[PDB]
Design a protein around this ligand. Structure first.
Ligand SMILES: Nc1ncnc2c1ncn2[C@@H]1O[C@H](COP(=O)(O)OP(=O)(O)O)[C@@H](O)[C@H]1O
Ligand SMILES: [Mg+2]
Lengths: 526, 525, 529
């Protein structure tokens, strides 16, 4: 029992959703976001100033409107997913683009033409972001960036060192130490891009992660779907009192169902994750895990049933962190020999490799194993003070890492504003509805800056003007925090150019999507 | 299926909740609070005059409005949590601040500016509370304070003595004696800031505590989540007929589930508490416990499984008291040797220590082990009369202890009133909406005093005036109890300056929060 | 049936209404202002840019909110009454004063004091307006005032042209032309809207006119129906060989039949035309006609018999045109002193006339007598366009009038911005809420300048700052039409000091009142929930 909806009817419904999210989220953008209250079904209410936190809690009653909300949240988040920030900024830009877009379409503008224009606009914008970016590759550079985003010259050093040694494609993590001091330690471990097969395996509802400490790592290679072939090992581990991380190529049917039940029951704290990589590439990576873990790849190939698996064929580590997009293994306890075994065998095969693509990938396995897993044990005094430093340091890390990828640009929306000039120049060479699109982007670009100042209790439009007024130094901007105009850079208010380029491109993507939408097939109230 | 709400729509909703609580609560403020009737689903109705009692029972049907009520209750209670009182007073102040705040915001005032001013106002107010605070450090001082908060000159003495000997950073506890007399004894024991992992471990529903007498103290270091590795020791202790206190770094899954079931079942009376401190700091404190208890830290480090734990590796004490925020061990039966062993090894490492922070903390461990554990065995006659004295004396203690940290000020709202002048001076240097905020706080400050007189059946505004009239002695105030103006201090109507400073700062926090609220995402019915 | 609303509840409601109207209006303010579309009961709608016109159409469903809407309308109209222009400006200033003020009331300020301060602040403001006023002294100065008020160069031109060739004491009229084009035309001699009492009088068959060259004017107050009384003069004239125009309350019966027959005969060339006005004014006008032609009025109440009339007491003119409904006496031979004394009798009488209607009647007389009557016939392709184009002319005139009266000041709200420094100085001498009151005006004074710039696509606050910034030459302002800061006066962006002063005084009058509200007694929403 579906329900069809076409043309403006549909686009307007989606927009409604888009606005629901965007309006709740943008009140937090900038140094002085406003408070958003979220109520928990059981616990008492919560108050935030974090866009992502609020975005997660936004779900609308109406199917069609919700579809828009979800659709926005998705594309918006895939910004934080590649730069660890700017998910809220992408939402704001998107709202604007959607609004003006639908307005002009309703006034007779051609959707496709608007799109062609919105795209050309963004290109020009991005190109300005680039030519405006400050590279961060020096030692001092990387440290300073992190030092700021963390607000701790020490953690800055650590983050810098951690990167210095593990490398760009290396592994770095922030762990909640128990000690009251923050230190940097280079343990053994691995990390691949796969996450919990079921959101029920989550340990912490807030962070949406599944944290396992001192657990076994059952490394399978088959599709574990039968309970009978799993109960044996599941039992041995049950009596161990320890948690279990399953890394099969997939866990479905009974298998996955059981794992989830006992997990939510308290019988056994587990978490299933799909095997890293694909094809030949995968078994090779499953071994990399067994090596650093001290377990063995239970492959049906070398003939071996699961039920006959010993509570010793499965390696283990000090801590395992599972995200919906990534699995991390800290404290690998495999034989330092097996590990160096892969590292070398990987280098040998690296000389025999000819395709640049294959090379880069062996490179990452090489950098994961070697260098290992730079860990930043975070010291606190309160469970509270910890969550704080934990978050702060973690972000500072993601920030800095992104910062290195695409340089940095002036923050506080200022970079997006400087992009306007580039869009203006484009418009002068454009005409028709296409030019209108370019104009739409140009208007959008003002929102972030404006919204920040606005949230801070200032006249958005006014500040945005005074900023665009200064043409001398493009780094000239408004620091909504102190309420003064300064050099955003020299004021330590910067953003990973990667984050900005993304938020924009993503927002513009959602916009183009909706303008090009001619129908939506939703589910009728079940 | 959520439900968004923005701008004034939201703020007004929250305010509705804020008022629901506040209006039910404030009718109890002061020496003559009015009666509030609360019905119990099963038992017959209840009547109170206690703000906190009433606040707990306030839950609204509307999600949005309730959100406000809960939000208030939280911030309001985190005053009683740091001073053991003034939760109701913080509520009243908050109601006022929220009202005037929203009013002026609706008239076009800038929220942030109002905040900036509400803040500056509080500062100046607090600063006056301080400069007006009565220090409690004398012998008579500390005794009198406690004597009052306990309503027992004897317990006052004991509390005074207990503090006199164990010291500021020392350990003091109130235990439910079996004797019909109240005494002070200086045993052996420990105490850390961690409570029952599950509210189901509670022994007394009223006091919300978990009291275990002559129990074993299974000191673990791993995350006990498996039943198999716990059943062995759980069984040995089960046949002992004695209770058990588990102090692992955490108890979850099956382990925590089983412990709770048998507890509520009657199979085994236990209670799980998380391990004190964090990190290296923690294992060091887990040993301090084993030392005073006569047990051993079951650490997987020194290689040792839990199932193989003997009913002798776990020390024991005469009584263990568990609160949702604190665990107390009275009657430590560890070898007097193992104890003095930590005391000295702690002093040696204390000379090698250089960071002032690390020092102060070894200081508390040092004061916990040494001085010991001043215990106040509480004598009663009824299980009822006991819970009462228990609570009363315990609060009196916490009150007095806090009273020593930050001095005392005139009660009956009078101190808050004296803060007005400070706010006035501030306003004269302020302008715009910022000045308005300051004015909001200034108006709020009158509520407590006013409300008290009101509840007592007098003209609030009138009394509040006659008080602000006298400029000579700031301790001049109205005693709603006798219906006469007197020296609040010399009249024994004082308040821990810490309590007051908190209630204000907290209320003003809720206020600023709501004014800065632009949206709320609630769950649909 | 009533509902009693107090405190903030009441003020907010009122404010909602105030803003409802004000925001519909402000959309028009300035050169880049746009139009509002007012639905009419039957025909096409009204498409204006005029404050009061829009304001008057606004009617809110909620009683309290509506009361607010009304109070604001009053500000609009009373300003239109006192100056005919600057209604939008007054609305904006009122809105501004109401919000900034209502805020302060919520903050605990005493409204009464706020009022006193507002009042004092306005006085100081007005005084500064006068202080910057420049007297209108030439064709340019006027072309400017008009071009602006109408927001059209062309309109400003014709108004200047006409105004010039009709003197500042003249009279200009706006009429509905028939072609697509607008035309400016002057009325030569004395003329009134009465035509030939009988089509037979016609002289030209191609123009349906009655042209009498060098003729005698017979001015009879009473009617005329009896042939007898006429014959004596008709013979005297007939023998003169000259044409004759007879002006009497009416010419009927055998008396008219005579003139016609003789006319058609060739006996005597004549034409009859009813008296100009009515009541005592056509009596006073006949005399006007008298003084202009030179003849004598056969005043039935001065003691004159038509039968005893003489060529000695007849009016004489160089020419006479009579259309189906209009009469024009060209080249009247009247005595100069008779005219002037006839004129200065109206002047030395206007200075005692109140009802603006009586001042308009006693003005078209003094206009005719000064042969100074211009008329702009506005053309357009559609009724809707025309009705607005027509209106713009009317506003431009009202402006011009006011400009001549109290002077001219720099436009674009610039002049009111300059009033700020005055209120500022005043504040330094004020205390308490009274000082707050003054501050309210201080802020309000920016609204006009802001909204103009705003509706043009600029930052209100920004522009107002740069203006208030350069304090060397008060004539410094922003040209919201070109987007450049300039000397407002030199740029030709000026406003009649009268409208400015009025707008503010009216805005401030209602505004302050509102701030003193503490209760409202309205109708309980009839059958609603
Ligand atoms: N080009 C211009 N630049 C700056 N101000 C202008 C310009 N044209 C008109 N104005 C100003 O706009 C104002 C009011 O315009 P208008 O829309 O006609 O409303 P109102 O009913 O108040 O007269 C005046 O102060 C006038 O001088
Ligand atoms: Mg006008």
């Amino acid at each position: 029992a579906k329900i069809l909806v076409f043309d403006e009817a549909a686009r307007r419904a989606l927009e409604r959703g888009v606005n629901a999210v965007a309006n709740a989220v943008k009140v937090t953008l900038g140094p002085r976001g406003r408070n958003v209250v979220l109520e928990k079904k059981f616990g008492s209410p919560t108050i935030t100033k974090d866009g992502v936190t609020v975005a997660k809690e936004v779900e609308l009653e109406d199917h069609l409107e919700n579809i828009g909300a979800q659709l926005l949240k998705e594309v918006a988040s895939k910004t934080n997913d590649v730069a660890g920030d700017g998910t809220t900024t992408a939402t704001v830009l998107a709202q604007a683009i959607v609004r003006e877009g639908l307005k002009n379409v309703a006034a007779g503008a051609n959707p496709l033409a608007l799109k062609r224009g919105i795209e050309k606009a963004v290109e020009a914008a991005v190109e300005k972001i680039k030519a405006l970016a400050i590279p961060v590759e020096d030692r001092k550079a990387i440290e300073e960036v992190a030092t700021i985003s963390a607000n701790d010259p020490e953690v800055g050093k650590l983050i810098a060192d951690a990167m210095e040694k593990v490398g760009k494609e290396g592994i770095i993590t922030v762990e909640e130490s128990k000690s009251l001091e923050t230190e940097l330690k280079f343990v053994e471990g691995y990390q691949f891009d796969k996450g919990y097969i079921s959101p029920y395996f989550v340990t912490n509802p807030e962070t949406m992660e599944a944290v396992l400490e001192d657990a076994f790592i059952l490394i399978v290679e088959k599709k574990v779907s039968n309970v009978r072939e799993l109960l044996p090992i599941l039992e041995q581990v049950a009596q161990t009192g320890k948690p279990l991380l399953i890394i099969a190529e997939d866990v479905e049917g009974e298998a996955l169902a059981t794992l989830v039940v006992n997990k939510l029951r308290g019988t056994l704290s587990v978490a299933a994750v799909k095997a890293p990589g694909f094809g030949d590439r995968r078994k090779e990576m499953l071994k990399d895990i067994a090596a650093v873990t001290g377990g063995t790849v239970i492959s049906e190939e070398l003939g071996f049933k699961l039920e006959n698996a010993t509570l010793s064929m499965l390696g283990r580590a000090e801590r395992v962190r599972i995200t919906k997009d990534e699995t991390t293994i800290v404290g690998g306890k495999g034989k330092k020999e097996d590990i160096e075994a892969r590292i070398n065998g990987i280098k040998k095969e690296l000389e025999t490799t000819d395709s640049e693509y294959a090379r880069e990938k062996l490179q990452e396995r090489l950098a994961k194993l070697a260098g290992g897993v730079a860990v930043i044990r975070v010291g606190a005094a309160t469970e509270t003070e910890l969550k704080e430093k934990k978050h702060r340091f973690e972000d500072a890390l993601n920030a800095t890492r992104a910062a290195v990828e695409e340089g940095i640009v002036p923050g506080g929306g200022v970079t997006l504003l400087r992009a306007i000039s580039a869009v203006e120049e484009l418009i002068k060479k454009l005409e028709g509805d296409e030019a209108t699109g370019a104009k739409i982007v140009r208007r959008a670009l003002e929102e972030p800056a404006r919204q920040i100042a606005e949230n801070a209790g200032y006249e958005g439009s006014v500040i945005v003007q005074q900023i665009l007024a200064e043409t001398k130094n493009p780094r000239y901007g408004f620091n909504a925090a102190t309420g003064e105009f300064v050099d955003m850079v020299e004021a330590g208010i910067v953003d990973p150019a990667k984050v900005t380029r993304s938020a924009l491109q993503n927002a513009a993507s959602i916009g183009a999507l909706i303008l090009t939408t001619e129908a939506v097939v939703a589910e009728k109230p079940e």
